Protein backbone atom coordinates (compact mmCIF):
# COMPACT_ATOMS: atom_id res chain seq x y z
CA UNK A 1 0.00 0.00 0.00
CA UNK A 2 1.12 3.65 -0.56
CA UNK A 3 0.77 6.00 2.47
CA UNK A 4 -1.32 9.02 1.30
CA UNK A 5 -0.23 11.58 3.97
CA UNK A 6 1.15 14.88 2.52
CA UNK A 7 0.03 17.28 -0.26
CA UNK A 8 1.58 15.51 -3.35
CA UNK A 9 1.12 11.76 -2.57
CA UNK A 10 -1.24 11.23 -5.59
CA UNK A 11 1.72 12.23 -7.85
CA UNK A 12 4.84 10.05 -8.59
CA UNK A 13 7.87 10.40 -6.25
CA UNK A 14 9.34 13.89 -6.97
CA UNK A 15 12.87 14.38 -8.42
CA UNK A 16 15.57 16.48 -6.65
CA UNK A 17 14.98 19.36 -9.13
CA UNK A 18 11.22 19.17 -8.34
CA UNK A 19 11.93 19.31 -4.55
CA UNK A 20 14.32 22.31 -4.94
CA UNK A 21 11.59 24.34 -6.78
CA UNK A 22 9.00 23.84 -3.98
CA UNK A 23 11.65 24.92 -1.40
CA UNK A 24 12.40 28.03 -3.56
CA UNK A 25 8.63 28.86 -3.42
CA UNK A 26 8.48 28.69 0.43
CA UNK A 27 11.60 30.91 0.95
CA UNK A 28 10.23 33.58 -1.47
CA UNK A 29 7.36 33.86 1.10
CA UNK A 30 9.82 34.12 4.05
CA UNK A 31 8.88 30.77 5.71
CA UNK A 32 11.12 28.67 8.06
CA UNK A 33 11.97 25.09 6.87
CA UNK A 34 12.71 21.83 8.82
CA UNK A 35 13.18 18.04 8.18
CA UNK A 36 11.64 15.13 10.21
CA UNK A 37 11.82 11.25 10.31
CA UNK A 38 9.72 8.33 11.69
CA UNK A 39 9.08 4.55 11.37
CA UNK A 40 5.55 4.69 12.93
CA UNK A 41 3.08 6.02 10.25
CA UNK A 42 -0.15 5.93 12.36
CA UNK A 43 -2.38 8.92 11.25
CA UNK A 44 -2.57 10.19 14.90
CA UNK A 45 1.27 10.04 15.35
CA UNK A 46 1.70 13.86 15.58
CA UNK A 47 5.38 14.22 16.65
CA UNK A 48 7.95 12.86 14.13
CA UNK A 49 11.67 12.94 15.20
CA UNK A 50 13.47 16.31 14.56
CA UNK A 51 16.63 16.46 12.36
CA UNK A 52 18.52 19.42 13.92
CA UNK A 53 16.88 22.86 14.55
CA UNK A 54 14.64 24.63 11.93
CA UNK A 55 16.53 26.78 9.35
CA UNK A 56 15.12 30.26 10.17
CA UNK A 57 17.10 32.82 8.08
CA UNK A 58 18.61 30.51 5.39
CA UNK A 59 17.89 32.19 1.99
CA UNK A 60 19.21 29.46 -0.39
CA UNK A 61 17.54 26.03 -1.10
CA UNK A 62 21.04 24.46 -1.44
CA UNK A 63 21.37 24.62 2.40
CA UNK A 64 18.04 22.68 2.78
CA UNK A 65 19.00 20.17 0.02
CA UNK A 66 22.34 19.44 1.81
CA UNK A 67 20.64 18.63 5.16
CA UNK A 68 18.13 16.26 3.45
CA UNK A 69 21.05 14.49 1.67
CA UNK A 70 22.73 13.86 5.09
CA UNK A 71 19.56 12.44 6.76
CA UNK A 72 19.05 10.12 3.73
CA UNK A 73 22.49 8.46 4.23
CA UNK A 74 22.38 8.70 8.08
CA UNK A 75 18.84 7.65 9.18
CA UNK A 76 17.42 4.06 9.13
CA UNK A 77 14.79 2.82 6.61
CA UNK A 78 11.46 4.67 7.10
CA UNK A 79 9.87 8.00 6.03
CA UNK A 80 11.26 11.60 5.69
CA UNK A 81 9.16 14.84 5.32
CA UNK A 82 9.88 18.60 4.79
CA UNK A 83 7.68 21.21 6.59
CA UNK A 84 7.34 25.05 6.30
CA UNK A 85 6.27 27.29 9.27
CA UNK A 86 4.73 30.83 9.22
CA UNK A 87 5.10 32.81 12.51
CA UNK A 88 2.90 35.77 11.35
CA UNK A 89 0.18 37.02 13.80
CA UNK A 90 -3.05 35.25 12.73
CA UNK A 91 -1.22 32.03 11.72
CA UNK A 92 1.77 30.94 13.88
CA UNK A 93 1.51 27.37 12.44
CA UNK A 94 2.74 25.04 9.63
CA UNK A 95 1.61 26.04 6.07
CA UNK A 96 3.11 23.19 3.93
CA UNK A 97 4.23 19.52 4.36
CA UNK A 98 5.20 16.77 1.84
CA UNK A 99 6.96 13.31 1.94
CA UNK A 100 10.43 13.10 0.28
CA UNK A 101 11.59 9.46 1.05
CA UNK A 102 9.71 6.12 1.49
CA UNK A 103 10.55 2.48 2.54
CA UNK A 104 11.05 -0.29 -0.11
CA UNK A 105 7.58 -1.68 0.82
CA UNK A 106 4.78 -0.84 3.31
CA UNK A 107 2.30 -3.61 4.40
CA UNK A 108 -0.26 -1.12 5.84
CA UNK A 109 -2.85 -1.50 8.64
CA UNK A 110 -5.89 -3.55 9.85
CA UNK A 111 -8.86 -2.81 12.19
CA UNK A 112 -9.75 -4.39 15.60
CA UNK A 113 -13.44 -4.18 16.72
CA UNK A 114 -14.36 -4.25 20.47
CA UNK A 115 -18.16 -4.66 21.03
CA UNK A 116 -19.58 -2.35 23.78
CA UNK A 117 -23.21 -1.34 24.69
CA UNK A 118 -26.08 -2.06 22.23
CA UNK A 119 -24.59 -2.06 18.68
CA UNK A 120 -21.66 0.35 19.42
CA UNK A 121 -18.08 -0.67 18.39
CA UNK A 122 -14.78 0.82 19.70
CA UNK A 123 -12.26 0.74 16.79
CA UNK A 124 -8.42 0.51 16.95
CA UNK A 125 -6.13 0.95 13.85
CA UNK A 126 -3.01 -1.34 13.95
CA UNK A 127 0.29 -1.21 11.91
CA UNK A 128 1.89 -4.49 10.65
CA UNK A 129 5.50 -3.07 10.72
CA UNK A 130 5.21 -1.59 14.28
CA UNK A 131 3.64 -4.73 15.88
CA UNK A 132 6.48 -6.87 14.38
CA UNK A 133 9.77 -5.07 15.22
CA UNK A 134 11.16 -2.32 17.56
CA UNK A 135 12.08 1.24 16.36
CA UNK A 136 15.17 1.22 14.08
CA UNK A 137 14.42 -2.21 12.53
CA UNK A 138 10.82 -1.96 11.21
CA UNK A 139 11.69 -1.55 7.47
CA UNK B 1 -13.22 -24.49 10.16
CA UNK B 2 -15.93 -23.77 7.51
CA UNK B 3 -17.35 -20.19 7.47
CA UNK B 4 -21.18 -20.51 7.78
CA UNK B 5 -22.19 -17.09 6.31
CA UNK B 6 -24.70 -17.31 3.39
CA UNK B 7 -27.94 -19.28 2.76
CA UNK B 8 -26.47 -22.63 1.48
CA UNK B 9 -23.31 -23.11 3.63
CA UNK B 10 -24.70 -26.32 5.29
CA UNK B 11 -24.72 -27.91 1.78
CA UNK B 12 -21.58 -29.05 -0.20
CA UNK B 13 -19.89 -26.49 -2.51
CA UNK B 14 -22.34 -25.95 -5.44
CA UNK B 15 -21.45 -26.89 -9.06
CA UNK B 16 -21.53 -24.34 -11.95
CA UNK B 17 -24.86 -25.82 -13.19
CA UNK B 18 -26.28 -25.43 -9.63
CA UNK B 19 -25.14 -21.75 -9.49
CA UNK B 20 -26.65 -20.98 -12.95
CA UNK B 21 -30.10 -22.30 -11.80
CA UNK B 22 -30.21 -20.00 -8.71
CA UNK B 23 -29.25 -17.02 -10.95
CA UNK B 24 -32.07 -18.02 -13.40
CA UNK B 25 -34.51 -17.92 -10.40
CA UNK B 26 -33.50 -14.34 -9.37
CA UNK B 27 -33.79 -12.91 -12.94
CA UNK B 28 -37.29 -14.45 -13.39
CA UNK B 29 -38.24 -12.17 -10.42
CA UNK B 30 -36.60 -9.10 -12.07
CA UNK B 31 -33.78 -8.66 -9.46
CA UNK B 32 -30.38 -6.93 -10.04
CA UNK B 33 -27.23 -9.12 -9.52
CA UNK B 34 -23.64 -8.24 -8.37
CA UNK B 35 -20.35 -10.02 -7.32
CA UNK B 36 -18.11 -9.13 -4.29
CA UNK B 37 -14.71 -10.25 -2.79
CA UNK B 38 -12.88 -10.04 0.59
CA UNK B 39 -10.05 -11.58 2.69
CA UNK B 40 -11.44 -10.35 6.07
CA UNK B 41 -14.38 -12.65 7.11
CA UNK B 42 -15.30 -10.95 10.45
CA UNK B 43 -19.15 -11.23 10.89
CA UNK B 44 -19.43 -7.38 11.32
CA UNK B 45 -17.39 -6.70 8.10
CA UNK B 46 -20.38 -5.24 6.15
CA UNK B 47 -18.70 -3.83 2.99
CA UNK B 48 -16.96 -6.44 0.76
CA UNK B 49 -15.02 -5.10 -2.32
CA UNK B 50 -17.19 -4.51 -5.47
CA UNK B 51 -16.38 -6.29 -8.79
CA UNK B 52 -17.62 -3.72 -11.37
CA UNK B 53 -21.15 -2.17 -11.25
CA UNK B 54 -24.35 -4.27 -10.58
CA UNK B 55 -25.92 -5.88 -13.72
CA UNK B 56 -29.33 -4.12 -13.78
CA UNK B 57 -31.09 -5.11 -17.06
CA UNK B 58 -29.08 -8.28 -17.97
CA UNK B 59 -31.67 -11.02 -18.79
CA UNK B 60 -29.32 -14.03 -19.31
CA UNK B 61 -27.37 -15.91 -16.54
CA UNK B 62 -24.48 -16.46 -19.02
CA UNK B 63 -23.51 -12.75 -18.55
CA UNK B 64 -23.33 -13.27 -14.72
CA UNK B 65 -21.43 -16.60 -15.10
CA UNK B 66 -18.81 -14.87 -17.35
CA UNK B 67 -18.10 -12.11 -14.78
CA UNK B 68 -17.69 -14.67 -11.93
CA UNK B 69 -15.25 -16.67 -14.14
CA UNK B 70 -13.08 -13.50 -14.61
CA UNK B 71 -12.96 -12.62 -10.87
CA UNK B 72 -11.97 -16.26 -10.09
CA UNK B 73 -8.83 -16.04 -12.30
CA UNK B 74 -8.14 -12.34 -11.48
CA UNK B 75 -8.64 -11.91 -7.67
CA UNK B 76 -6.27 -13.20 -4.92
CA UNK B 77 -7.07 -16.18 -2.62
CA UNK B 78 -10.08 -15.39 -0.37
CA UNK B 79 -13.91 -15.48 -0.61
CA UNK B 80 -16.40 -14.56 -3.43
CA UNK B 81 -20.22 -14.05 -3.04
CA UNK B 82 -23.21 -13.31 -5.38
CA UNK B 83 -26.01 -10.95 -4.17
CA UNK B 84 -29.50 -10.03 -5.56
CA UNK B 85 -31.18 -6.61 -4.93
CA UNK B 86 -34.93 -5.66 -5.08
CA UNK B 87 -35.62 -1.88 -5.54
CA UNK B 88 -39.45 -2.23 -5.11
CA UNK B 89 -41.18 0.27 -2.72
CA UNK B 90 -41.45 -1.55 0.64
CA UNK B 91 -38.12 -3.38 0.18
CA UNK B 92 -35.26 -1.45 -1.52
CA UNK B 93 -32.70 -3.96 -0.09
CA UNK B 94 -30.84 -7.26 -0.80
CA UNK B 95 -33.09 -10.39 -0.98
CA UNK B 96 -30.49 -13.20 -1.56
CA UNK B 97 -26.75 -13.86 -0.89
CA UNK B 98 -24.56 -17.03 -1.13
CA UNK B 99 -20.78 -17.88 -1.20
CA UNK B 100 -19.38 -19.26 -4.52
CA UNK B 101 -15.57 -19.59 -3.82
CA UNK B 102 -13.50 -20.38 -0.66
CA UNK B 103 -9.75 -20.47 0.35
CA UNK B 104 -7.83 -23.81 0.54
CA UNK B 105 -8.06 -23.65 4.38
CA UNK B 106 -9.46 -21.24 7.03
CA UNK B 107 -8.00 -21.29 10.62
CA UNK B 108 -10.97 -19.34 12.13
CA UNK B 109 -11.17 -17.02 15.17
CA UNK B 110 -10.56 -16.77 18.97
CA UNK B 111 -12.01 -14.55 21.78
CA UNK B 112 -10.25 -11.90 23.96
CA UNK B 113 -11.89 -11.06 27.36
CA UNK B 114 -11.34 -7.61 29.00
CA UNK B 115 -12.63 -7.51 32.64
CA UNK B 116 -14.59 -4.29 33.50
CA UNK B 117 -16.93 -3.40 36.46
CA UNK B 118 -18.26 -6.18 38.76
CA UNK B 119 -18.43 -9.42 36.69
CA UNK B 120 -18.92 -7.72 33.25
CA UNK B 121 -16.63 -8.74 30.31
CA UNK B 122 -16.03 -6.77 27.05
CA UNK B 123 -15.49 -9.35 24.25
CA UNK B 124 -13.45 -8.96 21.00
CA UNK B 125 -13.51 -11.58 18.14
CA UNK B 126 -10.09 -11.96 16.38
CA UNK B 127 -9.15 -13.59 12.99
CA UNK B 128 -5.92 -15.69 12.70
CA UNK B 129 -5.42 -14.89 8.93
CA UNK B 130 -5.94 -11.08 9.33
CA UNK B 131 -3.63 -10.67 12.38
CA UNK B 132 -0.84 -12.54 10.48
CA UNK B 133 -0.62 -10.94 6.99
CA UNK B 134 -1.72 -7.74 5.10
CA UNK B 135 -4.62 -7.70 2.55
CA UNK B 136 -3.73 -9.61 -0.67
CA UNK B 137 -1.52 -12.20 1.12
CA UNK B 138 -3.74 -13.66 3.89
CA UNK B 139 -4.60 -16.99 2.14
Amino acid sequence: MRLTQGCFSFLPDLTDQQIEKQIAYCITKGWAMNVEWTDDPHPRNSYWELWGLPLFDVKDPASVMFELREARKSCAAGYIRINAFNAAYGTESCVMSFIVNRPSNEPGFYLERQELEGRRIAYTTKSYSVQANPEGGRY
Amino acid sequence: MRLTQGCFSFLPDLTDQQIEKQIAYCITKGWAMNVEWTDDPHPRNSYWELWGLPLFDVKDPASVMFELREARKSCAAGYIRINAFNAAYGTESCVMSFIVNRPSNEPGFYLERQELEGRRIAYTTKSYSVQANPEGGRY
Partner: peptide
Protein backbone atom coordinates in the same frame (compact mmCIF):
# COMPACT_ATOMS: atom_id res chain seq x y z
CA UNK C 1 17.86 -11.10 10.68
CA UNK C 2 15.26 -9.97 13.29
CA UNK C 3 14.04 -7.12 10.99
CA UNK C 4 13.22 -9.03 7.73
CA UNK C 5 11.75 -12.01 9.70
CA UNK C 6 8.53 -10.00 10.31
CA UNK C 7 6.84 -6.84 8.94
CA UNK C 8 7.28 -7.69 5.22
Amino acid sequence: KWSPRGGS
